[PDB]
């Protein structure tokens, strides 16, 4: 049992996300850590943490049982604090669970930068990509260039052979990078007779450098047609409860990076009828707070329902919330 969240009208892009975030215990602990961290010898006091305390207040209530039977919470307080930051919704496509995830993370970085005299920890969704290039003709490679992410936003590939789509396919499609042409190579010492070794073709190599504690994967199901009309991807992408991320590592080593599914945000319907909804694990009890559960839930604003894993895995995922786990035992 978890408490529901009220939604009169346009607030279910936040309810669905809040049910997903509250299913990531590492994100909750980071908030308890982030909202209580400070430095002793500093002379400036820390800037106030309206968002991270409001977000922690909600997510901690969404990771316990409902405090009175069948209670329904009200997260409108969080809408008000996000408007104290730089954010207002202008159009309908900003009522997006993925857009809000970036509005929240971006605003938590504001709270982090706003207390710069005190060490505040970095949030567990943060990770890095590594750009790299290798010369086809001489195997020489470039220094790495870094890029940062809070979610792996994956474009959904077009069908070649009619095999089912997998999260492996969408992830590889995102990291897979092309051959490049007309590029000078210094190990080849090329251009022309101005050096004396064998314009070349490179291969771009994009892989994962820092893998986050909480991994957010986004399927780009909502896009626009050629001529200004909404395009929705309905194709099922097959995902699993346990996810190996070793095939995407930059570093060539044997240590394993493994993730366990915590929640799935789903988008149902189309225009007028469209709705965001969330599958999530049930939170552990105040006894055994440390041992997570294997009973899933389906949460739709004020409505909460028990769900089977077959139901979660057969859904049409929009956001997949994975959390780093060490070994397979469950």
């Amino acid at each position, epitope marked *: 049992l978890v408490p529901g969240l009220v939604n009169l009208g346009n607030t279910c892009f936040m309810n669905s996300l809040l049910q997903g975030l509250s299913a990531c215990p590492a994100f909750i602990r980071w908030l308890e850590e982030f909202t209580s961290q400070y430095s002793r010898d500093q002379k400036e006091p820390p800037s106030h943490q309206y968002l991270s305390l409001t977000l922690l207040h909600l997510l901690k209530a969404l990771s316990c049982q409902e405090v009175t039977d069948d209670e329904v919470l009200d997260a409108s307080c969080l809408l008000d604090v996000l408007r104290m930051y730089r954010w207002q919704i202008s159009s309908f496509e900003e009522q997006d669970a993925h857009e809000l995830f970036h509005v929240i993370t971006s605003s938590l970085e504001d709270e982090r930068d706003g207390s710069g005299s005190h060490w505040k920890s970095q949030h567990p969704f943060h990770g890095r990509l590594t750009s790299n290039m290798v010369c086809k003709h001489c195997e020489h490679q470039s220094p790495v260039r870094f890029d940062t992410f809070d979610s792996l936003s994956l474009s959904i590939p077009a069908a070649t052979w009619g*095999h089912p789509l*997998t999260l492996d*396919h969408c992830l*590889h499609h995102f990291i*897979s990078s092309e051959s490049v042409r007309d590029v000078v190579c210094d190990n080849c010492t090329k251009i022309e007779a101005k050096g004396t070794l064998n314009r070349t073709t490179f291969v771009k190599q994009l892989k994962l450098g820092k893998l986050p504690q909480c991994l957010c994967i986004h399927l780009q199901r909502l896009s626009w047609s050629s001529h200004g009309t909404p395009l929705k991807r309905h194709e099922h992408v097959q995902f699993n409860e346990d996810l190996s991320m070793d095939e995407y590592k930059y570093h060539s080593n044997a240590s394993t990076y493994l993730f366990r599914l915590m929640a799935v945000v789903v988008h149902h319907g189309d225009m007028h009828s469209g709705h965001f909804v969330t599958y999530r694990r049930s939170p552990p009890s105040a006894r055994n707070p440390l041992s997570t559960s294997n009973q899933w839930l389906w949460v739709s604003d004020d409505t909460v329902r028990k769900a089977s894993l077959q139901e979660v895995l057969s859904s049409s995922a929009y956001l997949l919330f994975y959390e780093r786990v060490l070994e397979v035992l469950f």
Partner: antibody, heavy 116, light 108 residues
Framework: VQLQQSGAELVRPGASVKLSCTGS????????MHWVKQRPEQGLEWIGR????????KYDPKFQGKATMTADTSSNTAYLQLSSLTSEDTAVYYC??????????WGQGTTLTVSS | DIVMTQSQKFMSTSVGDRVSVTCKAS??????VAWYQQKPGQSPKALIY???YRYSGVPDRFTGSGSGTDFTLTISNVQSEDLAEYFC?????????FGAGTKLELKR
């Protein structure tokens, strides 16, 4: 549930041929369909891909000006047309319809032979 | 185009052996390889998709493995049903090229 195919036949080189494939427990309009060539030395070769719901056809560019892919819904049948044949076109030709739970459906083969 | 290269056109096996058929790709094809089985006088049968996922009715004996450019299909606790031709197929890029095919053979 089968993906049934037309029988074999012989023609002289330089002629032109048509092959057929038909469903039996499904409508071919539901999903993409492929044709592939098979012969023992050069192996399996994909020739093209058709979306029977419309006229969209994607080809291997070695076949693009010589093979031709068509279909009809009411007869539940797709056609492969082959032009200006040579001995190198002597092969077995399969249709294929993909499935997500079962393996993809293949039909019984259609052999094609050309010689004087 | 994608060139799919399997190592050996024939491979020997004991009756209860562990066989691994191998394939090398021209470049990174992601996870997008499928493994087919073909007995003589019959049409192909799809076994694995997305490099490692199985279809319905495919025994636990068949393990798909590999990523990007090198791939292997493994048959462990081999059975007398498994003597056949075995192909790989890439569906990352058009054209949807196949491998050369490995006949796996029974040794005495």
């Amino acid at each position: 549930v089968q993906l049934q195919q037309s029988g074999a036949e012989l023609v002289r080189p330089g002629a032109s041929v048509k092959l057929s494939c038909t469903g039996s427990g499904f409508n071919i309009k539901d999903t993409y369909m492929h044709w592939v060539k098979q012969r023992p030395e050069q192996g399996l070769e994909w020739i093209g891909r058709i979306d029977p719901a419309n006229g969209n056809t994607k080809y291997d560019p070695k076949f693009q000006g010589k093979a031709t892919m068509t279909a009809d819904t009411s007869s539940n049948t797709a056609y492969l047309q082959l032009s200006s044949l040579t001995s190198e076109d002597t092969a077995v030709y399969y249709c294929a319809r993909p499935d997500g739970y079962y393996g993809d459906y293949w039909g019984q083969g259609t052999t094609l032979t050309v010689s004087s | 185009d994608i060139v799919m290269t399997q190592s050996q056109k024939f491979m020997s096996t004991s009756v209860g052996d562990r066989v691994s058929v191998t394939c090398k790709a021209s470049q990174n094809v992601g996870t997008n390889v499928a493994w087919y089985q073909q007995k003589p006088g019959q049409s192909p049968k799809a076994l694995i998709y997305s490099a490692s996922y199985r279809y319905s009715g495919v025994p636990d004996r068949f393990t798909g493995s590999g990523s990007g450019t090198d791939f292997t299909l493994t048959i462990s606790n081999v059975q007398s049903e498994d003597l056949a031709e075995y192909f790989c197929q890439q569906y990352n890029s058009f054209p949807l090229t196949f491998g050369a095919g490995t006949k796996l053979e029974l040794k005495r």
